[PDB]
Design a protein around this ligand. Structure first.
Ligand SMILES: [Mg+2]
Ligand SMILES: [Mg+2]
Ligand SMILES: [Mg+2]
Ligand SMILES: [Mg+2]
Ligand SMILES: [Mg+2]
Ligand SMILES: [Mg+2]
Ligand SMILES: [Mg+2]
Ligand SMILES: [Mg+2]
Ligand SMILES: [Mg+2]
Ligand SMILES: [Mg+2]
Ligand SMILES: [Mg+2]
Ligand SMILES: [Mg+2]
Ligand SMILES: [Mg+2]
Ligand SMILES: [Mg+2]
Ligand SMILES: [Mg+2]
Ligand SMILES: [Mg+2]
Ligand SMILES: [Mg+2]
Ligand SMILES: [Mg+2]
Ligand SMILES: [Mg+2]
Ligand SMILES: [Mg+2]
Ligand SMILES: [Mg+2]
Ligand SMILES: [Mg+2]
Ligand SMILES: [Mg+2]
Ligand SMILES: [Mg+2]
Ligand SMILES: [Mg+2]
Ligand SMILES: [Mg+2]
Ligand SMILES: [Mg+2]
Ligand SMILES: [Mg+2]
Ligand SMILES: [Mg+2]
Ligand SMILES: [Mg+2]
Ligand SMILES: [Mg+2]
Ligand SMILES: [Mg+2]
Ligand SMILES: [Mg+2]
Ligand SMILES: [Mg+2]
Ligand SMILES: [Mg+2]
Ligand SMILES: [Mg+2]
Ligand SMILES: [Mg+2]
Ligand SMILES: [Mg+2]
Ligand SMILES: [Mg+2]
Ligand SMILES: [Mg+2]
Ligand SMILES: [Mg+2]
Ligand SMILES: [Mg+2]
Ligand SMILES: [Mg+2]
Ligand SMILES: [Mg+2]
Ligand SMILES: [Mg+2]
Ligand SMILES: [Mg+2]
Ligand SMILES: [Mg+2]
Ligand SMILES: [Mg+2]
Ligand SMILES: [Mg+2]
Ligand SMILES: [Mg+2]
Ligand SMILES: [Mg+2]
Ligand SMILES: [Mg+2]
Ligand SMILES: [Mg+2]
Ligand SMILES: [Mg+2]
Ligand SMILES: [Mg+2]
Ligand SMILES: [Mg+2]
Ligand SMILES: [Mg+2]
Ligand SMILES: [Mg+2]
Ligand SMILES: [Mg+2]
Ligand SMILES: [Mg+2]
Ligand SMILES: [Mg+2]
Ligand SMILES: [Mg+2]
Ligand SMILES: [Mg+2]
Ligand SMILES: [Mg+2]
Ligand SMILES: [Mg+2]
Ligand SMILES: [Mg+2]
Ligand SMILES: [Mg+2]
Ligand SMILES: [Mg+2]
Ligand SMILES: [Mg+2]
Ligand SMILES: [Mg+2]
Ligand SMILES: [Mg+2]
Ligand SMILES: [Mg+2]
Ligand SMILES: [Mg+2]
Ligand SMILES: [Mg+2]
Ligand SMILES: [Mg+2]
Ligand SMILES: [Mg+2]
Ligand SMILES: [Mg+2]
Ligand SMILES: [Mg+2]
Ligand SMILES: [Mg+2]
Ligand SMILES: [Mg+2]
Ligand SMILES: [Mg+2]
Ligand SMILES: [Mg+2]
Ligand SMILES: [Mg+2]
Ligand SMILES: [Mg+2]
Ligand SMILES: [Mg+2]
Ligand SMILES: [Mg+2]
Ligand SMILES: [Mg+2]
Ligand SMILES: [Mg+2]
Ligand SMILES: [Mg+2]
Ligand SMILES: [Mg+2]
Ligand SMILES: [Mg+2]
Ligand SMILES: [Mg+2]
Ligand SMILES: [Mg+2]
Ligand SMILES: [Mg+2]
Ligand SMILES: [Mg+2]
Ligand SMILES: [Mg+2]
Ligand SMILES: [Mg+2]
Ligand SMILES: [Zn+2]
Lengths: 50, 87, 126, 70, 50, 206, 119
RNA sequence: AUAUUGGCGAGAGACCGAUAGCGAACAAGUACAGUGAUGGAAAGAUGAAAAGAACUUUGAAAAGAGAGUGAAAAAGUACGUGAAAUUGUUGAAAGGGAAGGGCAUUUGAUCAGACA
RNA sequence: CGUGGAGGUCAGUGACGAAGCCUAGACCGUAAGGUCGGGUCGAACGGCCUCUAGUGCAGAUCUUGGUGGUAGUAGCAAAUAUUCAAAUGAGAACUUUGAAGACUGAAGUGGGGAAAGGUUCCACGUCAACAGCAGUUGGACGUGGGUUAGUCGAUCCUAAGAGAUGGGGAAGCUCCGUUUCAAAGGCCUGAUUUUAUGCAGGCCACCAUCGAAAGGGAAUCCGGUUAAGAUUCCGGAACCUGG
RNA sequence: AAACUUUCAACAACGGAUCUCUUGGUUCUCGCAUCGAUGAAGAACGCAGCGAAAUGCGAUACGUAAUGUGAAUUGCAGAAUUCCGUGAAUCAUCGAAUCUUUGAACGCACAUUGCGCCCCUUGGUAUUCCAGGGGGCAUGCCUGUUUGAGCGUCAUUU
């Protein structure tokens, strides 16, 4: 980075967005089954291979 | 020092993202994707790689269009509009 | 026993078809028999349960009680009666969920269509 | 909002498909306002932002709470 | 791999024969439709025989 | 057929202080390293995986099916055998039970049941019904859920409505004389069904 | 509310173009509001509304073109039937029913006769 | 008339029953490894119903103790049953470089029967 | 003898408690095993005659999973170093502030960048896990804000090299060739004053394209400003390219 | 004598066997013949009042049109005019549409949101420069149209 391509920025941006906890009201829905965000992700725990 | 101290220079991509399959398998110097074959007009696959095949066949995706063909067929590819009735 | 080549007594096939039926289908599944009074009155045995119908539980604990259906909770395969409720320990109230096959219809809400429905089952109406 | 009080600049999230020209005209046309220059940038959530500076004929702050926000 | 006074066999199974096994499970079904087919044909063919 | 076998697992050979079953390749996943293919491995493949070309049907000499069916028919007289077989017949007038050909023409369940009662089938019919239990097996969730006894088996000469008038009452079976099945004549290979023969049917026998 | 389509379809080509702008002004404004109120579902029913109008506008323009082509070789590929790629290249019923000069003579002279055994 | 481990639609089984059955009954070709080709998991069950524990009390809190709900809390979102290895407490007993075992009986503990 | 399924039967057992598990209690059998009581439990299950097999485990450096002894043990000892007080907080060896003692000693433990990472930046909130003592602190958790360009880079150029095209090989996936055995193209203005662009000169035969954020290359500086941006904002003063 | 060790049990731990479940898997059978330059399969990025997935969709974005049904949706908020009705709905059906960036993928490129050309139109005192809106330009091959090339070659000029 520093000087990145718009493709990579985009990818990085989409990744920012997916990186939030389970929105706690899903937990309330009928038959809801999701306890937490299983596909979460940390910058120093898992590199996103571009 | 073929081990770790040599590992420390690992910081240049050999493959980037591949347009056609988005896979980080697009070999930069070779300018071809090691997964799907782009830009080879045909998509890369092999019969010794059935698991791979399965990972990418029709149906693994949206079928944005094929979805609807069987319904369309079911109705003899009808054209026009539905009319009206009562209740 | 089944005799058609297009019906299936396969249990697994049935249970899925139940639980995964669409809102539209649940409407008919959530039928509720008419009251003796109402049956002889429209000549109909039962009806898919409308909302603002008037009803009487004839099974379970809430047996005997009556009220207006407040919502048909199709998602839950369950019906709610405005008047049949739980009061939690903290005094807040909660609707008890009722199965329409355990109610009886005591007054229909009536539409052009609802009448029409009754007419169609070879019924008659007051 | 600071830019809008102190800088006489309207700030908009603005189409990623649109260039500095198109932001200029569209603002111009949507708001009666006249526009001096238009800096743009791509936010890190992948949406584009226009810093839009009005000429000193217009008071953007005034303009802002005409468009309705405060 | 030779012993006892047994006859000599010639059981030709050294190719991948498990790949080319036809079990006529469909024996009853093919009869049915065979019968069904003749039934439509008689129908179709007006009064001619079959 | 391809199960347990969907892996590129190689063995690690000896010298690695661990047994030699093939092991899943690669890493980062815990599946990786695990024993493969072997019939004793979790996720393995079964020993001698079942095939469809196993034999399922059996060929009986045609003449011997008849020896059996005949034999079987003969037992449906012998009242003690019928008795031994389940089948409440202390009350029935005489065996073989022959009943009027009028039976064959009855077209209404209620009416048909009525007849069956009248001629002595009551207590056997009631024996089914009183007998319906939940299949004890896992069978009970492979479309084999309930269980119950065999009723009487009504042989007729001409279906003038009868097979239909009965097709709903528990345990009663019907059979055109001209057929006659060993499976119905001696259910579970025990001789002596309770048969109610119409006259018509009885005379055709011969 | 939410605009009705069968009500749109009687409005003029431009009484419709305008209504589309009004909604756009509204919807725009609504979004200015959205970032003050904690919830603004009213917005949903006006972005659906816009779809509806646009639909009707594109709808009537197509029926326009579609007619002023009706009945002639060559009309724009996207008014041509969809069917199937293959279905499209199938022989037409005519060029398929086609029968050789000497064949029809034969078909005429000796066709399959309705007959019957027994008697 | 023949073929069909693909596709769309259907009826079935002396099939498997969550370490089984397809790798996947679950946000599974996912998560995760690998430069890449490729590799590739684990993971179902509160209850009829959330009625998911108001209120008090100790606590910084988590929680504990009461209360309360419920057919049951010996069901408390660690949730049906809840084995074993292995562990804590309580009770009983034995132990001079292992422990366990066989025949026999003392002693302690425990118990069936049979009596009229 | 024992298991999973199947035909028959006992109109078998059961929510008034099926199955399962527990039990140095009872009884039958030489034995495989079978039977009962009590506890736990909560929806099913068994006897007999037959049928059937994915039908019986202590071992296979067996497979998966779970668990011990080892053991509160080895250990947590490289990189000179810590100290007093206040503040905060339930809580302070470790957070903040002040004081002191030191260190790195411009070949830096300073001030920036290229690759790589992708929000770690900044603020607010905050300690369940994580930071092999701790934690009130953090690159953690929660919630948010933040990356402004005619002049900085890219973009243009060409380098090794890559690589379409007429073609020539190859059964074919494709291999060769890069101006090659090709009918390979676009420019300046006149001709227009039906009218917009046909024909009038003449050139020019170059013969794709990709390939440099260190090579080449049009042009911006200072001052001020932010929690976090700045040769990018604001201020002033310039310069380049096209028109 | 205790601690300690060991054995049995009771309660409580650990662990998740067992039993019972099953919207799944497997296998058999029957019926059927429908992808794509009218842009398929596949990819990327986006779209909800409050979503990160899965599912759905495409800037008309968990959807538009139509048709059937006949009152829901539901975790909360909401509409409230949607209830004897051209009408609820995360309904069903589906014949009409919209369908971002792409992909055989087609103006040229592509580790670039990189760089041309043509037509229409609008704005900027503009046939030439800049900017907005629309519509276009790959390859091989077939039939045809038109414009042509070759002393390949016929005839006709005076
Ligand atoms: Mg790693
Ligand atoms: Mg390389
Ligand atoms: Mg290459
Ligand atoms: Mg290509
Ligand atoms: Mg009905
Ligand atoms: Mg219910
Ligand atoms: Mg001001
Ligand atoms: Mg910029
Ligand atoms: Mg052979
Ligand atoms: Mg061999
Ligand atoms: Mg077959
Ligand atoms: Mg024939
Ligand atoms: Mg095999
Ligand atoms: Mg070892
Ligand atoms: Mg397996
Ligand atoms: Mg069992
Ligand atoms: Mg039974
Ligand atoms: Mg028969
Ligand atoms: Mg609507
Ligand atoms: Mg066509
Ligand atoms: Mg079948
Ligand atoms: Mg499994
Ligand atoms: Mg598995
Ligand atoms: Mg399931
Ligand atoms: Mg995981
Ligand atoms: Mg469980
Ligand atoms: Mg539940
Ligand atoms: Mg408590
Ligand atoms: Mg009870
Ligand atoms: Mg209990
Ligand atoms: Mg319980
Ligand atoms: Mg709780
Ligand atoms: Mg359970
Ligand atoms: Mg438990
Ligand atoms: Mg003792
Ligand atoms: Mg002894
Ligand atoms: Mg046995
Ligand atoms: Mg058995
Ligand atoms: Mg079995
Ligand atoms: Mg024991
Ligand atoms: Mg006893
Ligand atoms: Mg008991
Ligand atoms: Mg029990
Ligand atoms: Mg239960
Ligand atoms: Mg046997
Ligand atoms: Mg098994
Ligand atoms: Mg075995
Ligand atoms: Mg053994
Ligand atoms: Mg073992
Ligand atoms: Mg052994
Ligand atoms: Mg072992
Ligand atoms: Mg310790
Ligand atoms: Mg130590
Ligand atoms: Mg050390
Ligand atoms: Mg020390
Ligand atoms: Mg040190
Ligand atoms: Mg210290
Ligand atoms: Mg020094
Ligand atoms: Mg020095
Ligand atoms: Mg340091
Ligand atoms: Mg820096
Ligand atoms: Mg990083
Ligand atoms: Mg953030
Ligand atoms: Mg920080
Ligand atoms: Mg803590
Ligand atoms: Mg850390
Ligand atoms: Mg620590
Ligand atoms: Mg700690
Ligand atoms: Mg954060
Ligand atoms: Mg420059
Ligand atoms: Mg450029
Ligand atoms: Mg080449
Ligand atoms: Mg270049
Ligand atoms: Mg450069
Ligand atoms: Mg340079
Ligand atoms: Mg400065
Ligand atoms: Mg700022
Ligand atoms: Mg900075
Ligand atoms: Mg300036
Ligand atoms: Mg100036
Ligand atoms: Mg100039
Ligand atoms: Mg003493
Ligand atoms: Mg206990
Ligand atoms: Mg089980
Ligand atoms: Mg159940
Ligand atoms: Mg099945
Ligand atoms: Mg079939
Ligand atoms: Mg594909
Ligand atoms: Mg959704
Ligand atoms: Mg909604
Ligand atoms: Mg209508
Ligand atoms: Mg739908
Ligand atoms: Mg659109
Ligand atoms: Mg291209
Ligand atoms: Mg582009
Ligand atoms: Mg031509
Ligand atoms: Mg010509
Ligand atoms: Zn690819």
């Amino acid at each position: 980075a520093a000087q990145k391509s718009f493709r990579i920025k985009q990818k990085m941006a989409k990744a920012k967005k997916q990186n939030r906890p389970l929105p706690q009201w899903i937990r309330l829905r009928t038959n809801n089954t999701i306890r937490y965000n299983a596909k979460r992700r940390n910058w120093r725990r898992t590199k996103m291979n571009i | 020092g073929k081990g770790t101290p040599s590992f420390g220079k690992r910081h240049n991509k050999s493959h980037t993202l591949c347009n056609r399959c988005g896979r980080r398998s697009f070999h930069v110097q070779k300018k071809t994707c090691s997964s799907c074959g782009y830009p080879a007009a045909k998509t890369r696959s092999y019969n010794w790689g059935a698991k791979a095949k399965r990972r990418h066949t029709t149906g693994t995706g949206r079928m944005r269009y094929l979805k609807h063909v069987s319904r369309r067929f079911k109705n003899g590819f009808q054209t026009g509009s539905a009319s009206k009735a009562s209740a | 026993a089944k005799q058609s080549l297009d019906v299936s007594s396969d249990r697994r096939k049935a249970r899925k078809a139940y639980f995964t039926a669409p809102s539209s289908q649940r409407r008919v599944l959530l039928s509720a028999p008419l009251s003796k009074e109402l049956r002889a009155q429209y000549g109909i045995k039962a009806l898919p349960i409308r909302r603002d119908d008037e009803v009487l539980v004839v099974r379970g604990s809430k047996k005997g009680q009556e009220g207006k259906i407040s919502s048909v909770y199709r998602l839950k395969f369950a019906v709610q009666v405005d008047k049949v409720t739980k009061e939690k320990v903290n005094g807040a109230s909660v609707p008890i969920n009722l199965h329409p096959s355990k109610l009886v219809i005591t007054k229909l809400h009536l539409d052009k269509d609802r009448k029409a429905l009754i007419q169609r089952k070879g019924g008659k109406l007051e | 909002m600071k830019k809008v009080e102190d800088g006489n600049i309207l700030v908009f999230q603005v189409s990623m498909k649109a260039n500095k020209y198109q932001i200029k005209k569209a603002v111009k046309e949507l708001y009666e306002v006249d526009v001096l220059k238009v800096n743009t940038l791509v936010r890190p959530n992948g949406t584009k932002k226009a810093y839009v500076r009005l000429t000193a004929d217009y008071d953007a702050l005034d303009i802002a709470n005409r468009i309705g926000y405060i | 791999a030779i012993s006892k006074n047994l006859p000599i066999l010639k059981n030709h199974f050294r190719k991948h024969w498990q790949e080319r096994v036809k079990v006529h499970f469909d024996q009853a079904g093919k009869k049915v439709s065979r019968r069904n087919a003749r039934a439509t044909r008689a129908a179709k063919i007006a009064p001619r025989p079959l | 057929e391809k199960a347990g076998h969907q892996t590129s697992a190689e063995s690690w050979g000896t010298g690695r202080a661990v047994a030699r079953i093939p092991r899943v390749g690669g890493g980062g996943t815990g599946r990786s390293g695990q024993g493969a293919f072997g019939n004793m491995c979790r996720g393995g493949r079964m020993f001698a995986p079942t095939k469809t070309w196993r034999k399922w049907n059996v060929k009986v000499n045609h003449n011997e099916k008849r020896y059996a069916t005949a034999s079987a028919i003969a037992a449906t007289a012998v009242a003690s055998l019928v008795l031994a077989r389940g089948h409440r017949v202390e009350k029935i007038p005489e065996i073989p039970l022959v009943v009027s050909t009028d039976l064959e023409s009855i077209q209404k369940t209620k009416e048909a049941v009525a007849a069956l009662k009248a001629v002595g089938a009551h207590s056997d019919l009631l024996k089914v019904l009183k007998s319906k239990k939940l299949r004890a097996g896992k069978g009970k969730y492979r479309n084999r859920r309930w269980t119950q006894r065999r009723g009487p088996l009504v042989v007729y000469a001409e279906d003038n409505g009868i097979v239909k008038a009965l097709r709903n009452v528990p345990g009663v079976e019907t059979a055109n004389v001209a057929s006659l099945n060993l499976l119905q004549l001696a259910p579970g290979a025990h001789l002596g069904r309770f048969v109610i023969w119409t006259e018509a049917a009885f005379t055709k026998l011969d | 509310a939410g605009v009705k389509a069968y009500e749109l379809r009687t409005k003029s080509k431009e009484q419709l173009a305008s209504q589309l702008v009004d909604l756009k002004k509204e919807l725009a404004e609504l979004k200015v509001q959205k970032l003050s109120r904690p919830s603004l579902p009213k917005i949903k029913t006006v972005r659906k509304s816009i779809a509806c109008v646009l639909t009707v506008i594109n709808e009537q323009q197509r029926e326009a073109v579609r007619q002023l082509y009706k009945g002639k070789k060559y009309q724009p590929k996207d008014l041509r039937a969809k069917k199937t790629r293959a279905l499209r290249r199938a022989l037409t019923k005519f060029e398929a029913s086609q029968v050789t000069e000497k064949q029809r003579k034969k078909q005429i002279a000796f066709p399959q006769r309705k007959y019957a055994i027994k008697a």
